[PDB]
Design a protein around this nucleic acid. Sequence first.
RNA 1: AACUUUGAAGGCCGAAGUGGAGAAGGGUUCCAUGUGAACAGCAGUUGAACAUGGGUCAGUCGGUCCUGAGAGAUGGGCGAGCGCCGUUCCGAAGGGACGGGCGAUGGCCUCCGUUGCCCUCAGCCGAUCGAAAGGGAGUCGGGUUCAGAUCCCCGAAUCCGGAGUGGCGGAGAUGGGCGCCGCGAGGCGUCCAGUGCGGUAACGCGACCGAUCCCGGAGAAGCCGGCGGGAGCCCCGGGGAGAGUUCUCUUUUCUUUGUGAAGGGCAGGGCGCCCUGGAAUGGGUUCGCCCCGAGAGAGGGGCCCGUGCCUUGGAAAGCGUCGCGGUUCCGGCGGCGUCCGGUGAGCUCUCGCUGGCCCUUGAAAAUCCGGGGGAGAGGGUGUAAAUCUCGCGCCGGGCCGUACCCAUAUCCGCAGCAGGUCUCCAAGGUGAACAGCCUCUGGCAUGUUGGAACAAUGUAGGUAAGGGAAGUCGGCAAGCCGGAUCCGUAACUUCGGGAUAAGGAUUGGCUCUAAGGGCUGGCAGCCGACUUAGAACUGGUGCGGACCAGGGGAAUCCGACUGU
RNA 2: GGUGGAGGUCCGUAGCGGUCCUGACGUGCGAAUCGGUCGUCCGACCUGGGUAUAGGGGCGAAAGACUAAUCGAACCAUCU
Lengths: 120, 69, 149, 114, 91
Amino acid sequence: RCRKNTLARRKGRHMGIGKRKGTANARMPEKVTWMRRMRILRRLLRRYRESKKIDRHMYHSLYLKVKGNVFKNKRILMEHIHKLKADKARKKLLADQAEARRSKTKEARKRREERLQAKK
Amino acid sequence: PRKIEEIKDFLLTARRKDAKSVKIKKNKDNVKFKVRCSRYLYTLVITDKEKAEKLKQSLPPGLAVKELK
Amino acid sequence: PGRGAPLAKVVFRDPYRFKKRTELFIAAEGIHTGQFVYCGKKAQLNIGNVLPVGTMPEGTIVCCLEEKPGDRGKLARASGNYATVISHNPETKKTRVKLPSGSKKVISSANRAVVGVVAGGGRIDKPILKAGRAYHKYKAKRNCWPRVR
Amino acid sequence: VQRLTYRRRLSYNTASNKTRLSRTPGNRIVYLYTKKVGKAPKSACGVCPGRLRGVRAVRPKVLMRLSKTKKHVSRAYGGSMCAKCVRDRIKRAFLIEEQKIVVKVLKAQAQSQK
Amino acid sequence: AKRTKKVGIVGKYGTRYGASLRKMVKKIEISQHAKYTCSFCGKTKMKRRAVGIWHCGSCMKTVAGGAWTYNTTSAVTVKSAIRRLKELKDQ
RNA sequence: AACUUUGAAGGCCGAAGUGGAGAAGGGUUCCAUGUGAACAGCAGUUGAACAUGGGUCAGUCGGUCCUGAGAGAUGGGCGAGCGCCGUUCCGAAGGGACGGGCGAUGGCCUCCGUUGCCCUCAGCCGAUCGAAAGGGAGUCGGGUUCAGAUCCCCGAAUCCGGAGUGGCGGAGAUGGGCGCCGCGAGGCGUCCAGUGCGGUAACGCGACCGAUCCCGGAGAAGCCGGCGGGAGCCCCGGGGAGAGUUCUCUUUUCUUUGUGAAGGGCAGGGCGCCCUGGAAUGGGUUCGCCCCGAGAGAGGGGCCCGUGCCUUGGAAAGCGUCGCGGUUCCGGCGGCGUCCGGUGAGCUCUCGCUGGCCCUUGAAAAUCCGGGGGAGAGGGUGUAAAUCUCGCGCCGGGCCGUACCCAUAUCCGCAGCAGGUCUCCAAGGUGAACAGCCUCUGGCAUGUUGGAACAAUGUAGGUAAGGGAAGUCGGCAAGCCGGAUCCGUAACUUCGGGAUAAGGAUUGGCUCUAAGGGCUGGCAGCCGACUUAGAACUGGUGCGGACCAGGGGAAUCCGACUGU
RNA sequence: GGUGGAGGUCCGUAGCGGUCCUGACGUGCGAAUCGGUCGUCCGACCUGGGUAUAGGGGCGAAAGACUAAUCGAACCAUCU
Ligand SMILES: [Mg+2]
Ligand SMILES: [Mg+2]
Ligand SMILES: [Mg+2]
Ligand SMILES: [Mg+2]
Ligand SMILES: [Mg+2]
Ligand SMILES: [Mg+2]
Ligand SMILES: [Mg+2]
Ligand SMILES: [Mg+2]
Ligand SMILES: [Mg+2]
Ligand SMILES: [Mg+2]
Ligand SMILES: [Mg+2]
Ligand SMILES: [Mg+2]
Ligand SMILES: [Mg+2]
Ligand SMILES: [Mg+2]
Ligand SMILES: [Mg+2]
Ligand SMILES: [Mg+2]
Ligand SMILES: [Mg+2]
Ligand SMILES: [Mg+2]
Ligand SMILES: [Mg+2]
Ligand SMILES: [Mg+2]
Ligand SMILES: [Mg+2]
Ligand SMILES: [Mg+2]
Ligand SMILES: [Mg+2]
Ligand SMILES: [Mg+2]
Ligand SMILES: [Mg+2]
Ligand SMILES: [Mg+2]
Ligand SMILES: [Mg+2]
Ligand SMILES: [Mg+2]
Ligand SMILES: [Mg+2]
Ligand SMILES: [Mg+2]
Ligand SMILES: [Mg+2]
Ligand SMILES: [Mg+2]
Ligand SMILES: [Mg+2]
Ligand SMILES: [Mg+2]
Ligand SMILES: [Mg+2]
Ligand SMILES: [Mg+2]
Ligand SMILES: [Zn+2]
Ligand SMILES: [Zn+2]
C-alpha cells in the first residue's frame, strides 16, 4: 500500500495545497536549495575551467556572479558563457585585425626609413 | 593470527618448540596450514594442491598433524 | 576568572640554581608575548618593566605598586588603574604617590611597581544589559549578587 | 530492528562509556567500547597551533608499548619541537652569538681608541 | 541590502533594554568584534579572546590591550609620557 | 475453574512503550518441587505466600590507585576540661638514591647481589581520607544453565610485573690500509676506525649505550550553529530458501540473505607539513567563511586517524531450509545457500573542519612519554664486549561485588497506594516533527472482582430549532478561529516591533505538461531523486474531511522586560 | 535581490512548573492526587551523586518561606 501510494507521489500526486502541513522551508529548505545550486554551478565553472573552455579571469567574475545570485540554474549560465564567448570572439577578431593593420603600417614605415637611409 | 608468505618461514615456524600442533583445512580453491604456537596461530594459504601435497610430507614427525574435516 | 585584568606567565631564569622559574605578573596594556620584561634596580624606564620608585623620575605612570617593600605588589592593580609619583625625598628615602582613589600616600622609595596602566581598561564603560550578564559576572567571583533591599 | 543494551553497570552516557556498533559472526549487533581518542604532542615552544608529525597520536600510557622510533622523529628536538621552530632556534642561537662577537670586537676597538 | 535604519549589532537585542542603553552598547559591541590590523604582521587578524587580551591569527602573538578596544587613548598618552621620561633620563 | 495452563479469535501499550537493560535502594524477593492452614480487601488448581532444596565462578567488568569541592592528623596556638582552631601557618618535617673507599658474609669466593659505616647528591608541600557517572594499561566471538555468563567450556588474543647462570635469534657488526702466499677464487701477519642507516625535506627503516638535573607534551577540557566523511537502522531494483493469499487479479505479500578483538594491506577524510616556483588583468576557495611575496594557484611528495573494504582469525563455528539416524542420554551427521547493486537536508552514534558567545574563558593529581645535556661503561680486531623501547620463548597476577526487581506488584510513601525516583537502546505509514492516530518486534489482560437491567441525582463526553450574554459579581464554562500556499496588514513606537495584526481566496481524487541533476566518450549514450509551478476532467461545494491546530479588535491602571 | 543564523526572541515535544474550571475527589489513588485548559522549553534552564553551612543557629531573586508530613524559633532526653 505504501509502494502504491509513493508511486503516485513520484508521479506528483497527494502533494497539493491541501495535503501540506509544513512550510516551504520545512519541506524543502531554501538553505539546502542554495547548497545544491552552489554545488552544481561551482563544479560547472570548475569543469569549464579545467577543460580549457573558460579562462581564470572570466571564471573569477562568473564565480562572483554565481555567489551574488544572478543565475537560477545551469542552462542560462551556459547561455551566458556562450554569449560571452561570442562577444570575446568578436572583440578578439577586431583586435587582431587592428593589430595586424598596425604591424603592417609600422613595418612599412620601417622599410621606408630603411630605403631612405640606404639611398642617403 | 599471522599469515606467513613463504614456505621456508612456515617450516622454520613448525620446527620451533612452541608449536603444539598443525592442522590442514581443505576448502575449495585453497589449502590452509595452521600451526599452533604459544602466542600466535600461524597460517599458510596455498592455492596449489600439488604444492600442498608436497608440503604435507615435509612436516616433522614430532609435530601432531590433524586433517580437519 | 573573576578578574578584569589579564595575567601574564613571565618566565625567569634563576640565578642560583639551574631551573626556569615562572611568575604571574599583572599584564599592563601594551605587553605582548615574546617580550623581554626586565626587573631590577638598573632596569630601563619603559612599559613592561618593573623598577623601584626611588629610581623612576617625576610623573611616572605605574601600577601594581607595593605599599611596603617586599609584598610582591598590592596597590593600584585592578583593571585600568594606575598610581602616579608626585615627588621624591632623598633624606629618609620616601616618595609621595597618589592613588587612583585620589589619596596622596607617603611610600618608601625601596619598593617597586610595573610601568603603565593595567590592561582591560574601560571595562565599566559598557553597561551590563541583563541579569544573565550580571549573574555570570558574579558567579565566577563570589556569592554577593542577589542584593535584596 | 535490534534494540540493544550495555554490557557494563555504568548506564550513563559518559566520556568513559563511548561506544560503537558492530556486527558479530553470530549475526547480531552489539556495542564495542571505543578507546578514548589520543592526540599528537604539541611543540615545546608554544607558538605553533598545529601538532607534531611522525608521532602516533594515542593515549599516554600506551606509549610504554610503542617502539622508540614510533614516539619521536630522528632529528634534534625530535618529537618535542617542530622543525620550523627548530631551524629558527638554530638561526637565533647562531646570530645572538655572532652579535656578541661583534660587541666584543667593538669593545676591543673602544679600548684601542681609549 | 540595508536591512535596518539606525540599529546595527544591537538588533539582536530586539525591543528590549532601552534605546539609549543600546546606543551606548552599540559602539563598544562593534569595537570589540571589529578585526584590527596587527602591528607585528600587518594582517587584519586581531581577534578579542577575553577582557584585555587580543590574539593575532597569523603570528599567534597575544597582546595585552584594552578591554573593548586594542589601544586605549589613556594608554597611548601613558606610553607617550613614559617615552618622554625615558628620553629625559637618557639625554 | 470467569480469573490456572495451552490453542484459536478480537483488542491494547503503538519503539520519550505496558518492550529489552542499568545506578540508588531492597536482600533471597531469582529458579525448581509440593501445599492450599493464614495473606494476595471476590476466587484461585495461581503468586513476590508457605515448606524443602539450589543459584552470583573475572589479570581484561567495576571497586581497589589518584585528586576535585572539601574533610582531617603532626608541629604550634587556645582551652578548667572532653577537646577546639589551624593544613603550611611561631617546625632540626628526608630514612631516599648515583658514584667512591673500608671490613664482613653468599655462590665453580671468577664476578655480582645483599647489608654495615664514612664521604658525596637531592628542593618541593605538606601524614592521611575524599568520585562503583571525573582521570585510570589491558577481552572478544560462539556454545552451555531450571537459575550464572566480556566470569563456566572451546577458539582467538591482549596488559602489567619478574626474567640470576641471561633461554634462542637480530641490532651494537665486523669494513679499510700496508706487507706476503696463491694463475686466480681466496687465505695469514700488523695499524687504526666502528654507541646504526637512508631521503633536498616534511621524515622513514626492526632495534640503534647512558646517570644527577632541566624543559616540554599527554592526562587536560565550556556552550551553540553550519558542513563533510564513516558506521548501525530505514528505502528501492533484482537473485535464492521457507511461509501468506490465490471464488478474480497479482514475475505478488512476510521473514532472512552475516563475520568480533588483535595484526598486515588498501580505500576515505584531515594538515597552521616539506621541495620547484614567483602571482595585479589580482587569483584560489566555502553553505557561510577564509587564504596569499611572513609565498596563492599548478606539479611532486610527507605525516595522522584509518571504528570503513580485503586478508590472517574463518567456516570448522552462527543462521535459513531439506534429508537420515541415536527407540534414548546427543556443541548428532550430511546436501545446498548465506548473492549483485543504487540511493537520500532521512533518524541515531562517532570523527574531522570551520565559525559564533562570554564584564562566564570553561578542573587537578596519579601515571606515561619525548627531548637538551654528557657525569660514566665497553673492547682492542674477536669462539668480541658494554647496551637493546626488535622478533620470539618461560612463570605469575592476590582481595571484595557479580542472581533478581529497577516500577501502575520486588525501592520510598503504614499497602500489590492513579504520588515520587537518576540513565541507555529507539522500526513502517501519515505528517514539519522524537506532536497525535494505526501497525511490525517485544509485552499484557483493562489495572483490590464478576453477573442482570439501563430508575432518579451524579462524573466524564456530546448535540440542540429561533434569539445571541437578555444568565451571572464577572463571557465562569463551553463554543468560534486554528495547518499550509497566494495577497494584504493599521494606530503607535525605544524604528528593532506590533504581526500569524486585522480582512480575503484556495485546499479532494485522477490524467498530463514544464522546470530544478550525476557518470562515460553547446553533442551523444547510460542512470538516479525528491520537490515547485501550471492546465484539463470529475465527485450531492466536498476536500488542513480523523488527528494535529492562535478567537480577534479598541481603551484604562500596575509592573519595563526574561526570571523567582 | 540573495547568503548568514544572532537573540536572557516567538509557537511548541520531552523536561521543569502549577493559572483557571474556585471541575473530580474530599471517612479519597493520595495526611496535597487526577482530567482538560495553561506558564516556560538555549539560558537568571532542569537534574543524580559528592560536599559545606545546625537551632536564637543556618539559608533565603525575601513568602517569616524552608530547615526530614514538625517552623513568628526543628527534633530527642533531662530539669519535670
Ligand atoms: Mg535563510
Ligand atoms: Mg543566590
Ligand atoms: Mg569511572
Ligand atoms: Mg565488520
Ligand atoms: Mg617517527
Ligand atoms: Mg522495564
Ligand atoms: Mg527486564
Ligand atoms: Mg518465581
Ligand atoms: Mg482474598
Ligand atoms: Mg580539626
Ligand atoms: Mg583515595
Ligand atoms: Mg572512580
Ligand atoms: Mg600551494
Ligand atoms: Mg557453515
Ligand atoms: Mg643526546
Ligand atoms: Mg545482572
Ligand atoms: Mg496495582
Ligand atoms: Mg491510544
Ligand atoms: Mg475498564
Ligand atoms: Mg478484569
Ligand atoms: Mg441554539
Ligand atoms: Mg441554528
Ligand atoms: Mg448583564
Ligand atoms: Mg474561558
Ligand atoms: Mg494589536
Ligand atoms: Mg491616564
Ligand atoms: Mg513582571
Ligand atoms: Mg526564549
Ligand atoms: Mg475544587
Ligand atoms: Mg463524596
Ligand atoms: Mg483504583
Ligand atoms: Mg514561550
Ligand atoms: Mg554561627
Ligand atoms: Mg529562591
Ligand atoms: Mg508579614
Ligand atoms: Mg520561643
Ligand atoms: Zn612551533
Ligand atoms: Zn601578527
